[PDB]
Ligand binder design. Sequence first.
Ligand code: FAD
Length: 385
Amino acid sequence: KNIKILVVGAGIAGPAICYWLKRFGFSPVLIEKYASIRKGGQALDIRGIATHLARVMGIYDQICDRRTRIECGRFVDSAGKVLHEEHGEKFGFRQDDEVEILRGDLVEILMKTIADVPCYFNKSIISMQQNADKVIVKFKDGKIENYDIVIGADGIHSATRRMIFDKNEYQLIHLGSYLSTFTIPNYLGLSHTDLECEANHKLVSINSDNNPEIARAGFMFRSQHILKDIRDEHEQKQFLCDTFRDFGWETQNILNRMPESDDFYFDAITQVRMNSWTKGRIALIGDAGYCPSPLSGQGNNLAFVGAYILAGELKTANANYMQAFSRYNALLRSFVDTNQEFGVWVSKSFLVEDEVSKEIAEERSNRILAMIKLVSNAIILPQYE
Ligand SMILES: Cc1cc2nc3c(=O)[nH]c(=O)nc-3n(C[C@H](O)[C@H](O)[C@H](O)COP(=O)(O)OP(=O)(O)OC[C@H]3O[C@@H](n4cnc5c(N)ncnc54)[C@H](O)[C@@H]3O)c2cc1C
């Protein structure tokens, strides 16, 4: 209304809740720690109830226009021999409403829906304090600003969570694996083709799709090693290179091109476990509160649903945040649990055994496809108008 609402983080959840807040009569302000919007990341899937929300948000056609268009998927051994080849569907469309899109393309689409929302980059909070009346936010500039409501949308490593919640109110559960992805020059000359090689509890992929000049690389692997500083990019890259030192295939050609990449991403595959996602005038959304991990395939869809419900409950409560936050926690809990359980289930076998029976792999793959459809629909959305 006139309420001062700060949204921390311009990823998926933060821009999404800004759209809903703006639509529902509020005037949010958005901040991003980085200098500009971060567009790295693998393809993600808009699935289940999130496809309905994308439609209501007015972005479904735009997402469809930016769908991935891989025509040929090959699984190869470390010498490059093709073990199995899959081909895409006609027109690059599924028969259902699901759509695969690069994360960066989705983030661009979301930011276009909130052109009327102030967004400040290079803004980083160093201190947060709240009383019964205001949230006091001190920035690295030295600025100090008071807000009625602060929404943490700042990802699995949420600074907002760290500054507001006691360490015993949240756990980061490592699921035993890591993910890295980045773009490099398309030195193989791939054309709408994805190559993937799996060995020794490790997976390496490389594709080129809609930009013929660039290729996107992906690395996933099991490891119990924990970094000294999970945010230290030098340590991340050294760990990635050590891990794949003897993998062979294209791994050295890819890793040797990381200095030419402007969108490097690396993170542990982890869940955020909390009994409540709010404290006083502070609410967490998306990965900051309930990251289901990349192995769920659902982080962006949980972010969509969380943004919608929190914004709606704030509208229904006529800006009475205590009531809205209570409803938010209650209405989202079952859906978060279902999606997190599915991520845990996938983690129990992902890359765990070097060689798996074909019969076993096929039954596992079929069950996962059935389960993810159920999980993605496991909520009844409230209506807010
Ligand atoms: C660059 C990038 C690439 C990713 N690639 C993948 C991928 O390939 N696969 C996958 O499964 N998940 C990936 N993720 C995570 C994925 O986006 C989430 O799992 C989910 O889809 C969206 O959750 P989110 O918006 O809550 O968090 P995020 O997408 O992580 O967005 C958090 C945002 O908050 C910003 N931020 C962080 N700290 C602060 C701070 N202190 N102050 C202000 N802003 C801050 C970040 O810069 C970012 O823009 C990626 C995230 C990022 C940021």
